[PDB]
Amino acid sequence: MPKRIVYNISSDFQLKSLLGEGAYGVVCSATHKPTGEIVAIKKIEPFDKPLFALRTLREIKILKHFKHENIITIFNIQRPDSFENFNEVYIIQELMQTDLHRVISTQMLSDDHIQYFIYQTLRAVKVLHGSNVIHRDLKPSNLLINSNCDLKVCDFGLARIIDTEYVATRWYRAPEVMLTSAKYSRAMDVWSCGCILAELFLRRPIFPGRDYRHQLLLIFGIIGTPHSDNDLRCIESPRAREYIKSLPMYPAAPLEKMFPRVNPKGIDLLQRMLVFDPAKRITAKEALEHPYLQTYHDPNDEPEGEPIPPSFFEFDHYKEALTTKDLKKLIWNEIFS
Numbered sequence: 001m002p003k004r005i006v007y008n009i010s011s012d013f014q015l016k017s018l019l020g021e022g023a024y025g026v027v028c029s030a031t032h033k034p035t036g037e038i039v040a041i042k043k044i045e046p047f048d049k050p051l052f053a054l055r056t057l058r059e060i061k062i063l064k065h066f067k068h069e070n071i072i073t074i075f076n077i078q079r080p081d082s083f084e085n086f087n088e089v090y091i092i093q094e095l096m097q098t099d100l101h102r103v104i105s106t107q108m109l110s111d112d113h114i115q116y117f118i119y120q121t122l123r124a125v126k127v128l129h130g131s132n133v134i135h136r137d138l139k140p141s142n143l144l145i146n147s148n149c150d151l152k153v154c155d156f157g158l159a160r161i162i163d164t165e166y167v168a169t170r171w172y173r174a175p176e177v178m179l180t181s182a183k184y185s186r187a188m189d190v191w192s193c194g195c196i197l198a199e200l201f202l203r204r205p206i207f208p209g210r211d212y213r214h215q216l217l218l219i220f221g222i223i224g225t226p227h228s229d230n231d232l233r234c235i236e237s238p239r240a241r242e243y244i245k246s247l248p249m250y251p252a253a254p255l256e257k258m259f260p261r262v263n264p265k266g267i268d269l270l271q272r273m274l275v276f277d278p279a280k281r282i283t284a285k286e287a288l289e290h291p292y293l294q295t296y297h298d299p300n301d302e303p304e305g306e307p308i309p310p311s312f313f314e315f316d317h318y319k320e321a322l323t324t325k326d327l328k329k330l331i332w333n334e335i336f337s
């Protein structure tokens, strides 16, 4: 483990390996000496900028509010010693074996495993959506996987309650999001799920855009360029509609020929997810009922979720901006709840 990685945690924990390292979070596996149980600990420094603190607060509230087989299980959160020296949050969770990005990049998955993985992802999206929560950052690296192929979603800080900012990786973001100030919608998560399913089939990301322009170019190269007014109707900005009209007119690609080895039923489901008009995209519930997933579908074992009021994230609607001191107290009081 790199010496540059410093955790200020209980002596009952012995850090083992670095699992993830970014500008927002750092994740390591650790041995809980007292029990010999190995866990994952996510370290976050949330108070340099408001966006980091907001992301931290949403992540911990969602983690502590949800209980679902396809949502990572949180075990504990370190209790800070003093409000003054409180500058790091440590989230203790169940240790998973790997993540779907690593699996896709290292394994030749069978159609059955692809079905099971997308099924579990959609089952988690169903409960979030039924609770009026959109994830906004679904992608393979945020899907945790165990040896028995159980999949659990993580990284809930970019979530919003449906009623500078961190944004999802461009490769998995819905087109309408990069074309205007689109209203939050469940359809954006479904788009990400479509990108994840396409990636499972292709074994590499399907829309690896180098930038905003390129991303839209790759997307339309596959789903087809919306041409008529009716198609361009979902786009609010007239400037955005004009820009789309300046792109080449691509027809929808023949996926049956683009994926001759893939299960036809899987391609059908994929085409129902990667639709330009967000309103025409299949819902998570409908996707679970799709023939491609009949082996796993169980209408009596797919939690619908319970509505969460927007006030759960009341801070997202503040007029007079929140100070970092305001956010520090909010996170502190959430830890002790």
Ligand SMILES: Nc1ncnc2c1ncn2[C@@H]1O[C@H](COP(=O)(O)OP(=O)(O)O)[C@@H](O)[C@H]1O
Binding pocket: 019, 020, 021, 022, 023, 024, 025, 026, 027, 040, 042, 072, 093, 094, 095, 096, 097, 098, 099, 141, 142, 144, 154, 155
């Ligand atoms: N509970 C966990 N068990 C095993 N690995 C994990 C766990 N949580 C995160 N990871 C690893 O750490 C990476 C980053 O974690 P993530 O929670 O997505 O934070 P970030 O906000 O930095 O993306 C994941 O992509 C995964 O490889």
Ligand SMILES: [Mg+2]
Binding pocket: 141, 142, 155
């Ligand atoms: Mg992540």
